[PDB]
């Protein structure tokens, strides 16, 4: 998985 | 906006 | 909060 | 792997 | 806080 | 923004 | 390896 | 896993 | 604090 | 920002 | 090796 | 593992 805050 | 990927 | 399983 | 965020 | 499983 | 990768 | 952040 | 604060 | 498993 | 890698 | 930071 | 403070 991944996450980009903005 | 934020981006979530799984 | 958030959760990505994979 | 899984990802948890709070 | 956060957690990355791998 | 921050970036998380697993 | 896993990653924990607080 | 990895983390970029900004 | 933080922890890197590997 | 800081960078963590495992 | 593992890395702990406080 | 590695850590870059900034």
């Amino acid at each position: 998985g991944y996450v980009l805050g903005s």
Side-chain angles (χ1 to χ4, degrees), chain A:
Chain A
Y2 50 85
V3 189
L4 285 50
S6 267

PDB file of all heavy atoms in Angstrom, chain A:
ATOM      1  N   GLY A   1       0.842  -1.230   0.000  1.00  0.00           N
ATOM      2  CA  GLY A   1       0.000   0.000   0.000  1.00  0.00           C
ATOM      3  C   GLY A   1       0.858   1.253   0.000  1.00  0.00           C
ATOM      4  O   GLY A   1       2.053   1.189   0.323  1.00  0.00           O
ATOM      5  N   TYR A   2       0.246   2.399  -0.347  1.00  0.00           N
ATOM      6  CA  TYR A   2       0.891   3.699  -0.203  1.00  0.00           C
ATOM      7  C   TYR A   2      -0.087   4.816   0.209  1.00  0.00           C
ATOM      8  O   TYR A   2      -1.278   4.689   0.064  1.00  0.00           O
ATOM      9  CB  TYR A   2       1.594   4.095  -1.501  1.00  0.00           C
ATOM     10  CG  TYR A   2       0.751   3.991  -2.745  1.00  0.00           C
ATOM     11  CD1 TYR A   2      -0.088   5.031  -3.133  1.00  0.00           C
ATOM     12  CD2 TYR A   2       0.754   2.831  -3.534  1.00  0.00           C
ATOM     13  CE1 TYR A   2      -0.898   4.932  -4.275  1.00  0.00           C
ATOM     14  CE2 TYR A   2      -0.033   2.745  -4.703  1.00  0.00           C
ATOM     15  CZ  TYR A   2      -0.852   3.807  -5.067  1.00  0.00           C
ATOM     16  OH  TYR A   2      -1.649   3.748  -6.211  1.00  0.00           O
ATOM     17  N   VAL A   3       0.458   5.910   0.697  1.00  0.00           N
ATOM     18  CA  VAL A   3      -0.296   7.113   1.085  1.00  0.00           C
ATOM     19  C   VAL A   3       0.485   8.364   0.717  1.00  0.00           C
ATOM     20  O   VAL A   3       1.701   8.464   0.986  1.00  0.00           O
ATOM     21  CB  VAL A   3      -0.545   7.181   2.639  1.00  0.00           C
ATOM     22  CG1 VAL A   3      -1.501   8.318   2.952  1.00  0.00           C
ATOM     23  CG2 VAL A   3      -1.060   5.894   3.162  1.00  0.00           C
ATOM     24  N   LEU A   4      -0.213   9.297   0.062  1.00  0.00           N
ATOM     25  CA  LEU A   4       0.292  10.614  -0.241  1.00  0.00           C
ATOM     26  C   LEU A   4      -0.569  11.572   0.592  1.00  0.00           C
ATOM     27  O   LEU A   4      -1.801  11.533   0.513  1.00  0.00           O
ATOM     28  CB  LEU A   4       0.143  10.897  -1.747  1.00  0.00           C
ATOM     29  CG  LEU A   4       1.096  10.226  -2.763  1.00  0.00           C
ATOM     30  CD1 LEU A   4       1.238   8.704  -2.606  1.00  0.00           C
ATOM     31  CD2 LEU A   4       0.642  10.526  -4.143  1.00  0.00           C
ATOM     32  N   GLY A   5       0.060  12.368   1.444  1.00  0.00           N
ATOM     33  CA  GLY A   5      -0.703  13.228   2.367  1.00  0.00           C
ATOM     34  C   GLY A   5      -1.432  14.331   1.612  1.00  0.00           C
ATOM     35  O   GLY A   5      -2.558  14.687   1.959  1.00  0.00           O
ATOM     36  N   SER A   6      -0.796  14.842   0.557  1.00  0.00           N
ATOM     37  CA  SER A   6      -1.333  15.935  -0.249  1.00  0.00           C
ATOM     38  C   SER A   6      -1.263  15.645  -1.728  1.00  0.00           C
ATOM     39  O   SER A   6      -0.476  14.810  -2.196  1.00  0.00           O
ATOM     40  CB  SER A   6      -0.567  17.234   0.017  1.00  0.00           C
ATOM     41  OG  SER A   6      -1.231  17.966   1.020  1.00  0.00           O
TER      42      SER A   6
END
